[PDB]
Design a protein around this ligand. Structure first.
Ligand SMILES: CC(C)(C)c1ccc(-c2nc3n(n2)C(=O)CC(CNc2ccc4ccccc4n2)=N3)cc1
Ligand SMILES: CC(C)(C)c1ccc(-c2nc3n(n2)C(=O)CC(CNc2ccc4ccccc4n2)=N3)cc1
Ligand code: FES
Ligand code: FES
Lengths: 359, 359
């Protein structure tokens, strides 16, 4: 039967092989919604070639490439199977992957969705917490695709643009935390400090009103509520690059600082993404857990398993889509408010593209 | 009957008359737990005398002094009346006010509590969201009091050191928001943007691991969950002083920016304090709502009423103390973890003062 409802799963993506690294970096530094640079069209290419060896080596250290597509595909597959039974009036459902910086690109997915002849299209960001730099950039790409191509969509669009406190997302984090807590020595279980770690933002982004830090905080609070505050925790921030100010404290300095102050049993919880990727497999597991943690003399440092193939996460995805369909929502109420100091004209047009959709 | 249980209500405090301003500022600039300054013991009196006229004028503009003591006393009285009936086994209950920077000082309250011969003492911070600069400094003053006087306490101590998501605190915020939403023109109700406003922190404090921003974010999310996301919102930060970087976006720049971008109906929500004080009556109501708002051409800007005398708030306080008593808790689990980059040796000794208390 002809696919009726398309679910576009949005993620920045990662290079699947070492050969994909260069184009990945090129598209990344060209993204003006992620960063603005002195003559983007020219400075980007240079940076991409300069950094390709370093980034290739990082991916070599974790097996030769990004696992994002594998996990996204597994999650998409399980989601669609549930949706076909959950929501027969909108079935058959089909998932599409729209990566921002690697193939299949957001634009290629949109083309296929259109070619497939869908009645309904759902832009489903895979970042639970909204940032204009992540979800915002992916939604702008959808708007820009139709504007630059110069035609109107042939399908009804809507977006699930954030979901930082969905009860089943929270349950999967809490489950993975408890499972990892059981792998500590029983005599140290109560010693364990939970470090929720999320990708940081430059302070220039924070200070213009990005909703991300507050939404990440909401996710952390719901998880710890569900765990009944069994262990002490902090929310810390990773992956800062460059010389400008970023939101701290940094995850690596926090691990170092805790160890030096006698807190030598630490559980890392990646709280802002739903699968393994370079940030967990390289930055946390190699850069921080292996090297840093042993130079500072940790007793035990573990990391909760990423959500990856957990079938409860697939139900979380399908419930989110199901509720979105039943509610006839076009977008969250939060998307209707642009950042108080937003300087980007596209954000207004992208917002109105979704709020104005025919039902 | 002899008071049995003392509830020490901790707050920074504010000058009750213009004559109290100077000493208020002197004690503030001497607080090493709030800030460090060169030649503090004599640079503080210098800054205090220099700024006294300016601060006196701000207090004159709102009626001649701080209302914190009036509201704290009203709230404490209602809390005691409920606690005597909620928990007869710990009655009679008596509240004490321990202000950090004005009379009655934290140290003076501890002396009266000891003199009253209480069995049980509860350090009850009036900041729902923990910051080392607020609750931390107040708790440190209790530890230092016994340290400097050189004796151990004659009453069993414990602390309610944070409560950012207490369900009755949340309900009081939501009630005051809805009440204020009704005061907008009906045709603009759905268009109102809710700006939750909280005192900012220097980035040096944020970056050392202060839990305040994450806890404020949690309060915001719980309030908006209760309001069923009826309106769009942002969390923004006020009261920055000095030239160093502070956590933004700033409340004033945020109001200006929204107004210039066509969002002309704004509801301010003081989310990090429980009564009116200089931040609401002067900074928000005069500096931002009257002055700033007039310049930018806003249509309607209102501020949710402070919790002040709301009897549901008194019920919240008594509920917190009662549950604290029933649970035999000495402090939150979160207090057992000092900041990952804490450089203050007192924080560990204060923490261990509370965790080691005889039950
Ligand atoms: C020095 C050179 C090498 C030229 C460079 C300069 C700047 C940058 C850079 N990197 C940024 N910049 N700027 C932003 O402005 C915003 C941002 C947010 N990104 C997220 C936010 C949340 C996330 C959650 C889950 C998973 C991923 C997430 N990613 N990352 C990169 C390189
Ligand atoms: C330039 C001169 C004049 C020398 C100056 C310099 C610096 C400061 C200054 N002010 C700070 N500094 N440093 C901090 O490091 C931390 C802080 C936190 N304060 C809160 C945090 C939450 C709150 C919630 C509810 C109610 C009140 C709250 N207050 N305030 C004052 C003056
Ligand atoms: S940058 Fe946040 S809405 Fe434009
Ligand atoms: S400053 Fe936060 S615990 Fe010492």
């Amino acid at each position: 039967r002809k696919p009726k409802t398309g679910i576009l799963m949005l993620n920045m993506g990662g290079p699947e092989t070492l050969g994909d690294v260069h184009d990945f970096l090129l598209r990344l530094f060209l993204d003006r919604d992620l960063m603005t640079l002195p003559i983007q069209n020219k400075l980007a290419p240079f940076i991409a070639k300069r950094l390709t060896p370093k980034i290739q080596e990082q991916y070599r250290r974790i097996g030769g490439g990004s696992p994002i597509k594998i996990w996204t595909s597994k999650q998409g597959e399980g989601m669609v199977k549930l949706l076909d039974e959950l929501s027969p009036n909108t079935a058959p459902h089909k998932y599409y992957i729209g990566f921002r910086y690697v193939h299949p690109l957001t634009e290629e997915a949109i083309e296929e969705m259109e070619r497939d002849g869908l009645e309904r299209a759902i832009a489903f960001t895979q970042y639970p917490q909204y940032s204009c730099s992540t979800t915002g950039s992916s939604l702008n790409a959808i708007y820009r695709y139709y504007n630059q191509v110069g035609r109107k969509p042939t399908m009804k669009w809507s977006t699930i643009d954030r979901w930082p406190t969905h009860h089943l997302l929270i349950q999967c984090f809490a489950d993975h935390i408890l499972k990892e807590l059981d792998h500590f020595p029983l005599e140290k279980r109560s010693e364990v400090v939970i470090l929720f770690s999320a990708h940081s933002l430059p302070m220039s982004v924070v200070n213009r009103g990005d909703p991300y830090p507050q939404e990440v905080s909401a996710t952390v609070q719901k998880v710890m509520e569900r765990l009944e505050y069994c262990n002490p925790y902090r929310l810390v921030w990773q992956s800062k690059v460059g010389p400008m100010p970023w939101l701290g404290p940094q995850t690596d300095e926090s691990i170092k600082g805790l160890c030096e102050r006698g807190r030598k049993n630490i559980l890392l919880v990646p709280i802002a993404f739903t699968s393994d990727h370079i940030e967990t497999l390289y930055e946390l597991d190699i850069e921080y857990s292996q090297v840093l943690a042993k130079e500072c003399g940790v007793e035990n440092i573990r990391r909760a398993e990423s959500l990856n193939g957990n079938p409860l996460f697939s139900k979380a995805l399908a419930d989110l889509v199901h509720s979105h369909i039943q509610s006839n929502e076009l977008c969250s109420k939060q998307l209707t408010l642009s950042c108080p100091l937003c300087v980007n004209p596209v954000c207004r047009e992208t917002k109105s593209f979704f709020t104005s959709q025919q039902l």
